[PDB]
Motif scaffolding. Structure first.
Motif, short mmCIF file in Angstrom:
data_model
loop_
_atom_site.label_atom_id
_atom_site.label_comp_id
_atom_site.label_asym_id
_atom_site.label_seq_id
_atom_site.Cartn_x
_atom_site.Cartn_y
_atom_site.Cartn_z
N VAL A 12 9.71 17.50 31.74
CA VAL A 12 9.30 17.79 30.36
C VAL A 12 9.02 19.27 30.18
O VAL A 12 9.33 19.86 29.13
N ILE A 13 8.45 19.91 31.20
CA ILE A 13 8.12 21.33 31.10
C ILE A 13 9.39 22.18 31.14
O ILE A 13 9.55 23.12 30.36
N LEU A 14 10.31 21.86 32.06
CA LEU A 14 11.53 22.64 32.19
C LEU A 14 12.39 22.55 30.93
O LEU A 14 12.97 23.55 30.49
N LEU A 15 12.49 21.35 30.34
CA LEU A 15 13.27 21.21 29.12
C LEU A 15 12.64 21.97 27.96
O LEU A 15 13.35 22.37 27.03
N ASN A 16 11.33 22.18 28.00
CA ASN A 16 10.66 22.86 26.89
C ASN A 16 10.79 24.38 27.01
O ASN A 16 10.93 25.06 25.99
N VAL A 17 10.74 24.92 28.23
CA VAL A 17 10.91 26.37 28.38
C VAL A 17 12.34 26.77 28.03
O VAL A 17 12.57 27.84 27.45
N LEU A 18 13.32 25.91 28.34
CA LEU A 18 14.69 26.18 27.92
C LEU A 18 14.84 26.01 26.42
O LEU A 18 15.65 26.71 25.80
N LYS A 19 14.07 25.10 25.82
CA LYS A 19 14.09 24.92 24.37
C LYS A 19 13.64 26.18 23.64
O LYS A 19 13.89 26.32 22.44
N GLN A 20 12.99 27.11 24.34
CA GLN A 20 12.49 28.34 23.75
C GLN A 20 13.43 29.51 23.95
O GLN A 20 13.33 30.51 23.24
N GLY A 21 14.33 29.41 24.92
CA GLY A 21 15.18 30.52 25.23
C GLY A 21 15.77 30.36 26.61
O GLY A 21 15.16 29.74 27.49
N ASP A 57 24.65 15.83 33.52
CA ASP A 57 24.31 14.99 32.38
C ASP A 57 24.66 15.64 31.05
O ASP A 57 24.59 14.97 30.02
N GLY A 58 25.04 16.92 31.05
CA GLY A 58 25.29 17.63 29.81
C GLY A 58 24.06 18.05 29.06
O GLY A 58 24.17 18.46 27.89
N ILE A 59 22.88 17.98 29.68
CA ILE A 59 21.65 18.35 28.98
C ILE A 59 21.49 19.86 28.91
O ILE A 59 21.08 20.41 27.88
N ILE A 60 21.81 20.56 30.01
CA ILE A 60 21.72 22.01 30.07
C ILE A 60 23.04 22.54 30.60
O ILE A 60 23.87 21.81 31.13
N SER A 61 23.23 23.85 30.45
CA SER A 61 24.41 24.52 30.96
C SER A 61 23.99 25.84 31.60
O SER A 61 22.89 26.35 31.37
N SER A 62 24.88 26.39 32.42
CA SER A 62 24.59 27.58 33.20
C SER A 62 25.58 28.68 32.86
O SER A 62 26.72 28.41 32.48
N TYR A 63 25.13 29.92 33.00
CA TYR A 63 26.01 31.07 32.84
C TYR A 63 25.43 32.24 33.61
O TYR A 63 24.21 32.33 33.83
N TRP A 64 26.31 33.15 34.02
CA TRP A 64 25.91 34.32 34.78
C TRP A 64 25.41 35.41 33.84
O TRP A 64 26.06 35.72 32.84
N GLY A 65 24.27 36.00 34.18
CA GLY A 65 23.67 37.03 33.36
C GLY A 65 24.30 38.39 33.59
O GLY A 65 25.28 38.55 34.31
N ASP A 66 23.70 39.39 32.95
CA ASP A 66 24.13 40.77 33.11
C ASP A 66 23.96 41.23 34.55
O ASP A 66 22.97 40.90 35.21
N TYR A 75 21.50 32.18 34.49
CA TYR A 75 20.65 31.72 33.41
C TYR A 75 21.03 30.30 33.01
O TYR A 75 22.19 29.89 33.12
N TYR A 76 20.05 29.54 32.55
CA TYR A 76 20.25 28.17 32.10
C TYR A 76 19.88 28.07 30.63
O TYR A 76 18.98 28.77 30.16
N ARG A 77 20.58 27.20 29.90
CA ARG A 77 20.29 27.04 28.48
C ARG A 77 20.34 25.57 28.10
O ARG A 77 21.11 24.79 28.67
N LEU A 78 19.49 25.21 27.14
CA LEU A 78 19.46 23.85 26.61
C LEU A 78 20.61 23.68 25.62
O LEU A 78 20.69 24.42 24.63
N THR A 79 21.48 22.71 25.88
CA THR A 79 22.66 22.51 25.05
C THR A 79 22.27 21.91 23.70
O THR A 79 21.11 21.56 23.45
N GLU A 80 23.26 21.80 22.81
CA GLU A 80 23.06 21.05 21.58
C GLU A 80 22.81 19.58 21.87
O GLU A 80 22.04 18.93 21.16
N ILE A 81 23.45 19.04 22.91
CA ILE A 81 23.19 17.66 23.32
C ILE A 81 21.76 17.52 23.83
O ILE A 81 21.11 16.49 23.61
N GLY A 82 21.24 18.55 24.49
CA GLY A 82 19.88 18.53 24.98
C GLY A 82 18.86 18.73 23.88
O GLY A 82 17.81 18.08 23.88
N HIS A 83 19.16 19.62 22.93
CA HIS A 83 18.27 19.82 21.79
C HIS A 83 18.09 18.53 21.00
O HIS A 83 16.98 18.21 20.58
#
Ligand SMILES: C=CCC(Cc1c(C)n(C(=O)OC(C)(C)C)c2ccccc12)(C(=O)OC)C(=O)OC
Length: 113
Positions: A12-21, A57-66, A75-83
């Motif tokens: 619950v905490i990890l999904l919420n910090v990603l929900k912020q950015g 699960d398609g809840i979050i996705s990953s990408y390489w930062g600068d 970096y990890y981000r909350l997807t539209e499916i996760g939102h």
């Protein structure tokens, strides 16, 4: 606190910090520790097994930062499916809430007879 209550709470905490950015693991760990007044020190291994599952699960996705900012940071981000799944949980809690309120409203207002 039992094993899977802690895993649920951590999810619950990890999904919420990603929900912020979008964020990286080391940054998430420090931000949670300072948002818990030092009591909650999250562990990298458990964070990656949670994210690795949330990725498939398609809840979050990953990408390489600068790479100017040091070198190679994921970096990890909350997807539209996760939102939306967070929004449904959302709905489901306030739905359960008034179902419970209705139960004793109905419980005592019928035990009156
Ligand atoms: C907001 C969404 C989180 C949630 C569902 C969820 C879990 C597992 N809750 C929970 O157990 O809270 C404890 C008892 C305090 C630990 C919640 C408590 C309040 C609202 C939702 C949840 C989730 O984390 O499951 C993956 C979800 O549906 O995200 C898509």
């Amino acid at each position: 606190i039992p094993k899977e209550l802690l895993r649920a709470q951590t999810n619950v905490i990890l999904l919420n910090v990603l929900k912020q950015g979008d964020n990286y693991v080391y940054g998430i760990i420090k931000q949670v520790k300072e948002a818990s007044n030092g009591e909650m020190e999250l562990n990298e291994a458990t964070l990656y097994t949670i994210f690795d599952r949330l990725e498939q699960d398609g809840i979050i996705s990953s990408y390489w930062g600068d790479e100017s900012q040091g070198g190679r940071r994921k970096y990890y981000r909350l997807t539209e499916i996760g939102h939306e799944n967070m929004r449904l949980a959302x709905e489901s809690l306030s739905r359960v809430d008034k179902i419970i309120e209705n139960l004793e409203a109905n419980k005592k207002s019928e035990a009156i007879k």
